[PDB]
Structures are given as C-alpha cells and as structure tokens.
Amino acid sequence: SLTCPQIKGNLTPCVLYLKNGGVLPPSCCKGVRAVNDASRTTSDRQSACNCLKDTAKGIAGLNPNLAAGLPGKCGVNIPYKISPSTNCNNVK
C-alpha cells in the first residue's frame, strides 16, 4: 500500500484541474490509477480514502463534482468519493 505522502504526491498534478476543470492532465490520471492499483485490502481502501480526504481539505476551492468524477475519467472506479468530508471508515 502507498503511504499518505505517496498518495499526495500522486495527486499534485491534479490540483489545477480539481479546482477549475478543463484539461485533465494524463499525469493526474496516472496518479489516480496508482492509488487505486495499490489499494488491495479493505484497510488499504479506507486508508487511501482518509489520505485523499485530507488531501482534498488542503486544496482550497477543490470542486467536489470534479473530484467525484475524476476516477471515472481516468478509467478508475474507487468505491468512495474524493472529498474533504467523505466517510472513509465505512468503505468496503
């Protein structure tokens, strides 16, 4: 599993997009995919969610529709939303 600093690093190329939309850089989607790909266990998924939530809290003006739709744009299903207030502790 990725550590939280690793998950944050994977998300840096997403920041502008996550605020404003427009061009979704492929390096962003590569990072989202990396997170999902490393999330093998249920705890891994809860932990990734909790890191992403903190990550989202730290992006001033993050748009929660863009964040919700980002994994699907990247061909990723993560079974929670990236948001500053997700209940991560119930993820399966």
As a dihedral over the C-alpha atoms of residue 45, residue 25, residue 11, residue 16, rounded to 10 degrees, the angle is -130
- Residue showing tokens 């093998």: 40
Q: Distance between CA atoms of 75 and 48, rounded to whole angstroms?
A: 18
- Could you give the number of structural domains in the chain? 1
Query: Which tokens sit at 39?
Result: 């999330």
Boundaries of domain holding 91: 1-92
Q: Which residues contact 25 (CB under 8 A, 6 or more apart)?
A: 13, 14, 17
Experimental determination technique: X-ray
The CA distance from 74 to 70, in Å, is 6
Burial of residue 85 (number of CB atoms within 10 Å: 0-12, 13-18, 19+): exposed
According to DSSP H, which parts of the chain are helical? 4-11, 15-20, 26-37, 42-57, 64-73
End-to-end CA distance of the chain: 16
d(CA 24, CA 87): 26
Tell me the CATH number at 9. 1.10.110.10
The C-alpha atoms of residue 17 and residue 45 are separated, in whole angstroms, by: 23
